[PDB]
């Protein structure tokens, strides 16, 4: 009771520099994501493409020792008063901008085996997101099925899929089925599948942070409007790291178009966009007070807190100071929904007593 | 079963077919916007370009008489219970996709002259939005000042500005300064400027209605992050026809970036993005319940209601029934703020006679 015990729907693991070096067949090794550290600069390379350049200050700001040592991660969880934590890739996210299905498939296979055998094995508190090919449905289905057998509870998809593979297209249907069948949550994490540095004028850093929402919103719109959620009532989707309050907003906007633009709408839905969102679309946030508002005043109950451990955008190391001010004066049942119960609906971890 | 007086922050006027033909030199008059309704299709010509080619339901997408007859429209106000109403262009919006600064400047003049002479003359319950050039700053300032001497209260800007004229750019500063001086509200209406992203697959109607939000969210982010509003505390902005609940969501999103990515953030603001949003950014809606949650639960008081007469996505003929459903068991001080007082803070109309 001397801490508020949280479940985090969002965090990242830094992969071993040599993950793909050691594990891939030799024909693919050089093409895997690798990095050069020189001057103040870390340049990431993927399959003959510079994909990212950061200064070492910011690169290493996201690299506290818990981001590397999984034994320190757990000590940081305890320290933050965090129990459950979903873990998303860092380096493996660049699989989502690969143009070669074979390279992407094999890199993903390597990541999924490492994450389960060398990280998730340390504690049942850690729930892992398995990657699945953004490029080929048969590769993604095969990997999700293989990941389920291994006991994975959720797959990661990039917010921006490859060209012609928008989330409303038929190509995704076999994956939505497999995911529904397997009981498996689809986690779409923002800032992935495309270049995140879109704006370069005055206000660039705030503009770009905003630009990452558009694919998230687009993704919900494509999954609702296409009927994908409607055909798969068991399929539940987590928009991770997008904030929350835009989700009921978008529920209203798709309802207006469904009702007033009825005559141009294809396909028809068994219920309204708003109902599909409120049933099956979850979303995570770190600091956003609007996230409570969406629950109390907009009937959007699918809100989950996340540390985004250990990015700057996240709460670490001030998790307790942050959640304490957010939920200062807030109904205990809503603090519990947002911080604990929505998590345990999506993900299985050992149950804290809700009594303590 | 009694009605209630509302102000409306969004509606449109259909300009005369011959509007620019009759008023422009030879070098010009053939290149101004031409709508053509024929064979179940709506086609729009601008400066040699087909800028739209949309299907029409010759059955269930039929236009209200009052769009086609400006005296049937004022009857439609009285019937719908609407006192003040902001009026935006229809065909005139096409000046914002124009590439020729001369065609744009001169069409804007023809429009601002006509709308005052022949439409706003009908009733001072009408608040006209004057167009100003999206292409040249000197020409945008000229026409704003001219429109102000003419008594215009607000200038229309397109959501998507021309390439290289993003709203974070220094090219707009003269126009912001002039808008503040003039005491003129800046109204950014959505679904205007060069068509950004058209979706083509399943759910296209619903996806395309969501797509038009992104230019608006982007526009607010550009104006907040760039210091435009911070440097101009008397400049006010209305986002017309985008809904509302995403605005506090975007305040939070921008505060997370401002606080957690302070090192990347240029320029600095005198107060947080969310403060500038809550102080200077207004947003309109027609049907969206979340618009009330934004006021009651997210401390966003800059919500206005609009009819969006005569568009399908508007409330006609059910304005009163819609507004009755929305405000059922809602503090009438909030009904008053959203339906009347925000309107009278932005706009001047004749005093509404008291009832009982
Ligand atoms: C492990 C990673 C994954 C990922 C990409 C590389 C790293 C890390 C994160 C990060 C990126 C982590 C911040 C969250 C998130 C979701 C974003 O995308 S936030 C948007 C990007 N923000 C930034 O790059 C930092 C702010 N800086 C900028 O915006 C620009 O560098 C500039 C300030 C405009 C300078 O340009 P210039 O005008 O001076 O020429 C992720 C995406 C994720 O895929
Ligand atoms: Mn994250
Ligand atoms: Mn992050
Ligand atoms: Mn004909
Ligand atoms: Mn409108
Ligand atoms: Mn409209």
CA B67 vs CA A37, B11, B41: distances in Å: 65, 10, 18
| Beta pairing, strands B154-158 & B126-131 | parallel
Chain A hits for B40, Cβ within 8 Å? none
CA A55 vs CA A40, A91, B24, B60, B288: distances in Å: 5, 16, 56, 58, 44
Resolution (A): 2.5
The alpha carbon of B129 and the centre of ligand 5 are apart by a number of angstroms equal to: 12
Nearest CA to ligand 1 atom 26: A205
A215, A160 contact by CB (below 8 A):
yes
CA B44 vs CA B53, B95, B104: distances in Å: 7, 12, 16
The alpha carbon of A314 and the centre of ligand 3 are apart by a number of angstroms equal to: 7
The candidate with the shortest Cα–Cα distance to A86, out of A223, A186, A211, is: A186
B265, A205 contact by CB (below 8 A):
yes
| Token pair listed for B223 | 């104006």
Q: Could you give the CA distance from residue A182 to residue B132 in angstroms, rounded to a whole number?
A: 56
B135, B98 contact by CB (below 8 A):
yes
CA B36 vs CA A43, A44, B23, B91, B183: distances in Å: 54, 53, 19, 11, 38
Residue A321: other Cβ atoms inside 10 A = 9
Strand partners, A186: A155, A237
Please tell me whether the peptide bond between B267 and the residue prior to it is cis, using omega within 30 degrees of 0.
yes
Technique employed here was X-ray
Query: For ligand 1, what atom is nearest to the CA of residue A204?
Result: 34
Contacts of A195 (CB under 8 A, 6+ apart): none
Q: Could you give the CA distance from residue A217 to residue A289 in angstroms, rounded to a whole number?
A: 19
Q: Could you give the CA distance from residue A264 to residue B246 in angstroms, rounded to a whole number?
A: 25
**Is A260 annotated as contributing to ligand binding?**
yes
Residue in chain B lying closest to A314 (CA): B260
Q: Phi then psi for A58, rounded to 5 degrees?
A: -85, -45
Chain A stretch 181-200, residues whose beta carbon is closer than 8 A to a beta carbon of chain B: 199
Task: Tell me which of A205, A213, A216, A312 to substitute to probe ligand 1's pocket, judged by most ligand atoms within 8 Å of the beta carbon.
Answer: A205
Q: Could you give the CA distance from residue A67 to residue A95 in angstroms, rounded to a whole number?
A: 20
A164: alpha, beta or left, given left = phi > 0 and alpha = psi -120 to 50? Answer: left
Q: Phi then psi for A107, rounded to 5 degrees?
A: -55, -40
| Beta pairing, strands B185-189 & B154-158 | parallel
Which long-range contacts does A191-195 make (Cβ < 8 Å, 24+ apart)?
A191/A93, A191/A159, A191/A241, A192/A93, A192/A96, A192/A156, A192/A158, A192/A159, A192/A160, A193/A96, A193/A97, A193/A134, A193/A158, A193/A159, A193/A160, A193/A161, A193/A162, A194/A97, A194/A158, A194/A159, A194/A160
Chain B hits for A166, Cβ within 8 Å? 199, 201
CA A298 vs CA A126, A255, B157, B339: distances in Å: 31, 14, 31, 19
Answer yes or no: do A222 and B244 touch at CB < 8 A. Answer: no
> Which ligand sits nearest to residue A187's alpha carbon?
2
Smallest Cβ–Cβ distance between B206 and the set A202, A221, A249 belongs to A221
Check CB contact of A259 with chain B, cutoff 8 Å: yes
The alpha carbon of A81 and the centre of ligand 1 are apart by a number of angstroms equal to: 28
Query: For ligand 1, what atom is nearest to the CA of residue A199?
Result: 34
**DSSP H helical segments within chain B, as ranges?**
65-68, 70-80, 101-114, 137-149, 173-182, 204-211, 213-225, 246-260, 273-280, 290-298, 319-327, 332-336, 342-346
Angle at B278 between CA B274 and CA B284, to 5 degrees: 120
**Is B103 annotated as contributing to ligand binding?**
no
Smallest Cβ–Cβ distance between A267 and the set B55, B59, B202 belongs to B202
The domain tally of chain A equals: 1
Q: Which domain holds residue A238?
A: 1-356
Answer yes or no: do B253 and A218 touch at CB < 8 A. Answer: no
Residue B206: other Cβ atoms inside 10 A = 28
3-state SS, residue B249:
helix
SS3 sequence of chain A = CCCCCEEECCEECCCCCCHHHHHCCHHHHCCCCEEEEECCEEEEECCCCEEEEEEHHHHHHCCCHHHCCHHHHHHHHHHHCEEEEEEECCHHHHHHHCCCHHHHHHHHHHHHHHHHHHCHHHCCCEEEEEECCCCCHHHHHHHHHHHHHCCCCEEEEECCCCCCCCCCCHHHHHHHHHHHHHCCEEEEECCCCCCCCCCCCCCHHHHHHHHCHHHHHHHHHHHHHHCHHHHCCCCCEEEECCCCCHHHHHHHHHHHHHHHCHHHCCCCCCCCHHHHHHHHEEEEECCCCHHHHHHHHHCCCCEEECCCECCCCCCCCCHHHHHHHHCCCCCHHHHHHHHHHHHHHHCCCCCCCCCC
**Distance from the first to the final alpha carbon of chain B:** 16
Chain B hits for A290, Cβ within 8 Å? 248-249, 251-252, 298
Q: Could you give the CA distance from residue B338 to residue B332 in angstroms, rounded to a whole number?
A: 10
Q: Could you give the CA distance from residue A307 to residue B36 in angstroms, rounded to a whole number?
A: 55
The candidate with the shortest Cα–Cα distance to B257, out of A200, A248, A273, A206, is: A206
CA B180 vs CA A113, A312, B150, B232, B235: distances in Å: 60, 36, 17, 7, 5
Tokens 């065609």 found at: B103
Chain A hits for B267, Cβ within 8 Å? 202-203
């Amino acid at each position: 009771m001397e801490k508020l015990w949280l479940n985090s729907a969002d965090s990242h693991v830094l992969e071993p520099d040599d993950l793909w070096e050691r594990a891939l067949p030799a024909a693919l090794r050089d093409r895997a994501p690798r990095c050069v550290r020189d001057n103040g600069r870390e340049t990431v390379y993927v399959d003959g493409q510079v994909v990212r350049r950061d200064p070492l200050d910011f690169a290493d700001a996201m690299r506290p020792p818990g981001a590397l040592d999984h034994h320190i991660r757990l000590k940081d969880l305890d320290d933050q008063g965090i129990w459950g934590e979903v873990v998303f890739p860092s380096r493996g996210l660049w699989t989502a901008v690969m143009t070669d299905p074979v390279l992407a498939r094999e890199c993903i296979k390597v990541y999924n085996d490492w994450l389960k055998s060398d990280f998730l094995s340390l504690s049942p508190r850690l729930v892992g997101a398995a990657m699945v090919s953004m490029l080929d449905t048969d590769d993604a289905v095969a990997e999700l099925r293989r990941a389920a057998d291994l006991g994975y509870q959720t797959v990661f998809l990039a917010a921006t899929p490859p060209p012609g593979r928008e989330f409303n297209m038929d190509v995704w249907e076999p994956l939505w089925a497999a995911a529904e069948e397997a009981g498996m949550t689809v986690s779409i994490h923002i800032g992935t599948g495309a270049d995140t540095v879109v704006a370069r004028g005055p206000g660039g850093a705030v503009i770009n942070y905003v630009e990452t929402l558009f694919p998230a919103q687009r993704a919900v719109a494509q999954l609702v409007a296409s009927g994908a959620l409607d055909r798969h009532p068991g399929l539940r989707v987590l928009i991770a790291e997008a904030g929350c309050a835009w989700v009921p907003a978008l529920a209203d906007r798709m309802d207006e178009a469904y009702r007033q633009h009825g005559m141009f709408v294809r396909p028809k839905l068994s219920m309204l966009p708003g109902e599909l969102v409120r049933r099956q679309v979850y979303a995570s946030f770190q600091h956003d007070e609007t996230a409570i508002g969406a629950v109390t005043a907009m009937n959007y109950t699918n809100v989950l807190w996340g540390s985004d451990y250990p990015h700057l955008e996240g709460t670490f190391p001030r998790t307790q100071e942050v959640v304490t001010e957010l939920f200062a004066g807030v109904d205990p049942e809503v603090r519990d929904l947002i911080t604990r119960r929505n998590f345990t609906d999506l993900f299985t971890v050992p149950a804290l007593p809700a009594t303590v």
